[PDB]
Design a protein around this ligand. Sequence first.
Ligand SMILES: Nc1nc2c(ncn2[C@@H]2O[C@H](COP(=O)(O)OP(=O)(O)OP(=O)(O)O)[C@@H](O)[C@H]2O)c(=O)[nH]1
Ligand SMILES: Nc1ncnc2c1ncn2[C@@H]1O[C@H](COP(=O)(O)OP(=O)(O)CP(=O)(O)O)[C@@H](O)[C@H]1O
Ligand SMILES: Nc1nc2c(ncn2[C@@H]2O[C@H](COP(=O)(O)OP(=O)(O)O)[C@@H](O)[C@H]2O)c(=O)[nH]1
Ligand SMILES: [Ca+2]
Ligand SMILES: [Ca+2]
Ligand SMILES: [Mg+2]
Ligand SMILES: [Mg+2]
Ligand SMILES: [Mg+2]
Lengths: 438, 349, 424, 54
Amino acid sequence: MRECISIHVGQAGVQIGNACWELYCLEHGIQPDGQMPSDKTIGGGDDSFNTFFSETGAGKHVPRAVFVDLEPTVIDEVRTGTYRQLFHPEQLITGKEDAANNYARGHYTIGKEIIDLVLDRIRKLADQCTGLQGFLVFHSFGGGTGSGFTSLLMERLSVDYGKKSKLEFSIYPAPQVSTAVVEPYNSILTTHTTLEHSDCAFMVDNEAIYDICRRNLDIERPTYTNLNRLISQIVSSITASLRFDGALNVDLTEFQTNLVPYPRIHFPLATYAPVISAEKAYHEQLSVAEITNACFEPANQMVKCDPRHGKYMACCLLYRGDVVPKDVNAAIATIKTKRSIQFVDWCPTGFKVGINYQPPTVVPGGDLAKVQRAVCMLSNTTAIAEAWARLDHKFDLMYAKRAFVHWYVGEGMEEGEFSEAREDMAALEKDYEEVGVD
Amino acid sequence: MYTFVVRDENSSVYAEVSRLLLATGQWKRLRKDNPRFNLMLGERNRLPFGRLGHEPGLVQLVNYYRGADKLCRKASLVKLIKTSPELSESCTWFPESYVIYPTDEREVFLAAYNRRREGREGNVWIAKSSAGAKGEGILISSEASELLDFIDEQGQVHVIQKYLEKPLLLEPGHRKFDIRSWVLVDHLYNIYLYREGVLRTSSEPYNSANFQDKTCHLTNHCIQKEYSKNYGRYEEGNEMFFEEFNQYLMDALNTTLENSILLQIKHIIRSCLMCIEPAISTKHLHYQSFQLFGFDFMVDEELKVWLIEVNGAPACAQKLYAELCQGIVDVAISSVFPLAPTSIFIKLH
Amino acid sequence: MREIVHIQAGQCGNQIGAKFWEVISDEHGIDPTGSYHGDSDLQLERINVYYNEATGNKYVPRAILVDLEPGTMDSVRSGPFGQIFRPDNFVFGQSGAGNNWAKGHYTEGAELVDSVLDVVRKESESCDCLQGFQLTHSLGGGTGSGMGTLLISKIREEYPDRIMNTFSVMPSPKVSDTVVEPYNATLSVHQLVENTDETYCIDNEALYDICFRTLKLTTPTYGDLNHLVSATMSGVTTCLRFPGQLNADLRKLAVNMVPFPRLHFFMPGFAPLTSQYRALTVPELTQQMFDSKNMMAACDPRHGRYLTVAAIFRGRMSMKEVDEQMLNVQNKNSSYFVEWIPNNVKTAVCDIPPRGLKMSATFIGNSTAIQELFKRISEQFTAMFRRKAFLHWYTGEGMDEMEFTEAESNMNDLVSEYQQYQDA
Amino acid sequence: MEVIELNKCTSGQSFEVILKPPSDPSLEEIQKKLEAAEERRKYQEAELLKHLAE
Ligand SMILES: Nc1nc2c(ncn2[C@@H]2O[C@H](COP(=O)(O)OP(=O)(O)OP(=O)(O)O)[C@@H](O)[C@H]2O)c(=O)[nH]1
Ligand SMILES: Nc1ncnc2c1ncn2[C@@H]1O[C@H](COP(=O)(O)OP(=O)(O)CP(=O)(O)O)[C@@H](O)[C@H]1O
Ligand SMILES: Nc1nc2c(ncn2[C@@H]2O[C@H](COP(=O)(O)OP(=O)(O)O)[C@@H](O)[C@H]2O)c(=O)[nH]1
Ligand SMILES: [Ca+2]
Ligand SMILES: [Ca+2]
Ligand SMILES: [Mg+2]
Ligand SMILES: [Mg+2]
Ligand SMILES: [Mg+2]
C-alpha cells in the first residue's frame, strides 16, 4: 500500500479541498469525528482507503493533506467547520497578508518567507509513509497565491522528492466569477515556471462549471459552493481508483502512463454526466448509452472547446453505478459511427474503462440528485489548446501597452520574465498545432 | 441595437450585407478588433473560431462554418467523397478524380488511365490546383505524361480529373457553359437554395480537337472577358439567367429547367451538406454559424448534372447582389437577431 | 490586511471626514457613544477595518483629526458623533495657513507634522495587519492641500510598503474662496501623482451643479455638497467594510484599477439622486449611475475612454438582473471602454443598503476624460502666472519661481499622458 | 473491437477496448533567483528613500 499526500493552496484550492474531503468521508463511511465503524483493524491496516487516511490508536482516520493560504480567512472556516475534528493544527498553515492577485508577490516577496515552513510540515506526513508515491496539488490560475506560491512549491518538491509524481487540479479563470483584471498574467507566469515540474494537470474552467450549474441544475446565479460541490464529484471520479479496490489507475504513475505520451502536453480534458437537479422530483434514469454519448457534448466538458477539430492521444472512461462491460462496449460501438473521433496516427484508437459498482455519493441536501450510474471521461485532445489561445490573446492585448506591469517589477520581477513566459506558451501552442492539425 | 465587426474588406457580398444592416438603424458597426460583437463577418484565412462564444451576455454568430473547408478545397473534396460511406466513392454525380502530390494516388491514377487507354475510351484529363486563381494553373491533355510533368513543376498539390468531353452546348454558338447556384446554410442547418442561378458561358465555339486554346474550354469570367474575342456577343457579360435558359430548354429540348437539371442540383447539394453535418453543426455549440456557398455544376449532353467544385467565399452576379443580400439578412441574421412575401429560397429537407 | 488608518486635514477635510463617520457608524449599528445596537451579524464581521475595540465592547474610530487652526475641529467635537472620536487623536495648532500652500507645506505645517506622525505611529503599532491610510482634504486651501501633501510624503518615508489613498476636493471658480486656489491645487497634484496609490477626485463644480439642476436646490450650501460626498464615500468603501469577494482591500483594489502608476485619479458616481419613496428598478439604477449627471468630477465621460471601472450595488435585489444590466451597459457603449484591457468592469453586491434607500449603486471610474479637470486648473494657473500675479504670498514663505514652473510642467505632462492613452 | 485485460473484483471491474491500432534546477539556483529578486526590491526602495531625503 502506497500513500498519497494532497496539498491545497489559496482560496480556490482550500475551498475545493474542503468539498472533496467531505465527499470522501461520505463515500468511505467516516463520521465527521474521524471514527469509522466499518474499519475493523483498529489503529492500523493497509487497505485501499489507507492511501488517503492514516490511523491513530484511538481509531481516528486522518486525511493525508496540507492546507496553505497566505491569509487566514478561508482556512479558519476549516478549523471551525463540520470536519474540524478531522485534521490537526500542523496540517493547516496560514500567513497574515496575501499576494493581492500578484504572481510576483506570491512567488518572490511572500513565498520566500513561508516555503521552508510548508516543506517541513509536508516532510512530517512523508515520514509517516511506508511508500509515498506523490502529491496532488489544488490551486487557481488567477490568484496571487494559487499561481505564485504554487509554482515555487513545485520547484522545491522536485528537488526534495525527485522521484515522486505530481498531479495538478487547476482552476482556469472566467470573467463571470473572477476577481481580478490581471488573471491572464498570473495564469501564464505560473504555467511557465510550473510546466516542467508537473506530470499531469486537470484544468477546470469556471465558465464551464458556471453554465452547467445554470443549465442542468437550474441555479439562477451559481455560487462557489454550487461550483465546488460539482467540482468535487468530478475530482472524486478521478481519485476513486486510488481509494478503492480496482485495477486501473491504481497509482499516480499510471495517470502519466495512460494519459500523457508527451510530457509538455499533459492537460487532459474532463467530461462528466449526468448532472441532474435534485428538486426535479420525477426524472427518468439515463442508460449507459445515454450517459456515454453525453461525454461527447461540449456542454458537459470542464473546458468549452470543440474536440471535433482536434485529435485524441488517449481516452479513459470511469463509471460508477450499475454498469457492466457489455453495455459499455455496445454504447461505444454506436458512438463511433455517429461522432468525429480522430486519434493521432501514432496512437491506438481505443479506450481504457474502469467500473466501480458503488454509485455516486451526493452530499445530503445538495443540488445534485442521486443517480443509478454516472461516468467521467478523461481525454487528451489537442482541442484544449483553444483555452491557451484565449488566454494568450488577453495577455497580448495588455502587455503591448505594459498595462499593470509595474506592479510585478515593483516586487522584484524583471520585465524579461514576462516575454520569457509568453515565448514558452507560444511554443506550447505550436506543439499542439503540430500534433493535431494537418 | 445589435453590433457587428468586419474582418474581410475584400468581400463584395458582405460589403453589401454590411450596408443593409446599417440602413436598418438597428445595427452598429464596431472597430474590427472589438470583441463585444453580436455578428462577425470574418476573415478568409485563420479565422479565430477558438475565441468565439466566450463573451458573457452576448449571443455570437459568424458567417463561416469551422471545418467546411473539407468541402471547399479541391484536394480535400476528393478525399471527402472517396472515404465517406454516405457518399460511397461511387456516387454518380462526381467525376473520377485522383489526388497527386509533386497520401498520394499516383499509382491508382495510372491504372485507370491504362484501362481507358486499352479500352479506347475518351482519355482527356484536366489537372488543377487550389492556388489556381483566375484562369492560371490548369492543363487539359489526353496524355498522362504531360499532366504529371506539369504537376512536378509546381510545388503545390494537384488533382487529376476526367475532362467532361461531351458537354451540353448552347445554340447558336456551339458553346460551353457552367451553372452557379448560391446556397445558404443557417444556424439550424436549414438548407436554402437561392431561386436565381446564373450560367457563365464561353463566347467561343467548343473545339474538341485543340485543348491548348483554353478559351472555349474554360468558362471563367476572367478568361472570357480577356482572351475571347467574342465577349458579350450573345448575352450581356457571358451570363445567361434562369428565365432565358428555361425558355430555351422548352424551345429546343421540350423540357423545363426544374425537371431536367434542378432535381439533380437539389439532390447534390443535400448529399454534400448532410454528409458533413455531424462534423460542423453548431446546434449545441457555444457560438453559431451560417455560411453562403457557391456550387459549380456541369451539364452533359444527356442532361445529367455533374458537380465541379464548391466555393466557400463566393461572389455574386452584378444584377443579383441586391435581392440575395437582403435574403441573407432576413434568413440568416434577423432570424437570430430579430428586428422591430414569398421567399426567394427553396428549403431542402 | 484588515486595519485602515484614517486621517482628515483642514476645514474641508474635517467637515467631510466627520459626515463620513456619522454615515458609516449608522450602517454598522454603532451609536454616538461607541456602543453597538445592531441586529445583524454582517454589521460586526469587518468592523475592525475602521474601528478599534475598547473595554466594555466599545468601538472607537481609527481616525486622526488635523488642522492648523482650532475652529473647525471644535465644531466636530461638538457635532452629532463628536464624542465617539479618541480625544488624543485631535492634533492642531493656532496660526492657520491663510489659504497658502507654502504655509501648510514648508513653514506652519512643518512645525506641527511631527506630532501628527506620533499619533499615526501609535495607531499603526497596535494593528494586527495594517492595510494603509486614507486621507480626506481639499486642494484649494493651505492646510489640507499643503500640510496634507507633506503628511503623505512623510508617511510614505516611514511606511513605504503600505497603500496610500485620498479623497481630494478640487476647486472651482463657481464655488470659490480665494483667487489663489489654482496655485494651491497645481502644487498639490504634483505631490499626489508621486505619493498616492488611489485618489478620488471630487470636483466642487459637479457637486454644485447636481444640487442646483438635479436636486432642485436654488441656493446650495457646503452642507448640501457634503451630503453628496458622504453618500459617495460610504459607497466606495462598502467593499472594504462588509464581507465580499471583489476589491475587498486597498491593494487588490489598486491592482484592479491602476494600470500605470501615475494614472490613479478616479471619477466617482452615485445613484439615485432625487429631490423619495418610489422603488428604483435595477435597470434604473444602472442607467443613472453611468450618466454624467451623476458624476462627481465635472468631466464628460463621452469625451474620453474608461481604463477600468468598479461598480457596487447595495440592497436586496436580483443578482441575475444586476449581471444582465451591467453587461448591457458595456455591450451597448463599447466605444467608451479601452479594448486593450479585457473585462475591465467589475461588479460587487452587498445585501445591506444605505440608510433611507431600498437599493443604491456606486460607480468608480478610471477615465481619460479626467484630463479635462487638470486642463481647467492648468488654464486658471497660467492666466495668473504669466503676469506673476499673487506670487508674493508664496515668495515671502521662501518659495522660488522655478518651483511653480516645475509644478506646471508636471501637470501638463499628466494631461499629455492621459491624451496618450485616449488615442492608443 | 477487441476487449483485453479484464480484471474483476468484489467492488468492480476494468478492461480495455481497442478499435484500431496505430499508423531540474538545483536548490542553490532557486535560492539565487529568489535572492536576486529581493536585491532588486531593496535597490528600488533605497532609491525612493534617497529621493525622499532630497
Ligand atoms: N471554482 C472555484 N473558483 C474559485 C474559488 N475561489 C476562488 N476561485 C477563483 O480563483 C481565482 C482567484 O484566485 P484565488 O484562489 O481566490 O486567489 P488566492 O490563491 O487566494 O491568492 P491571493 O491573490 O493571495 O488572494 C478567480 O478566478 C476565482 O474565480 C472557489 O472556491 N471555487
Ligand atoms: N472535369 C471537368 N470537365 C470539364 N470541364 C471542366 C472540368 N473541370 C473544370 N472544367 C472547366 O474549367 C474550369 C476550371 O475552373 P476551376 O474548376 O478551377 O474553378 P476555379 O477555382 O478556377 C474558379 P471558381 O472558384 O469560380 O470555381 C471550370 O469553370 C469549367 O468550365
Ligand atoms: N465640498 C466642500 N468643499 C469645501 C468645504 N470647505 C471648504 N471647501 C473648499 O475647500 C477649498 C480649500 O479650503 P479649505 O479646505 O477650507 O482650507 P484649509 O483649511 O487650509 O485646508 C476651497 O476650494 C473651498 O471651496 C466643504 O465643507 N465642502
Ligand atoms: Ca484499519
Ligand atoms: Ca511658529
Ligand atoms: Mg486569497
Ligand atoms: Mg476556386
Ligand atoms: Mg476655508
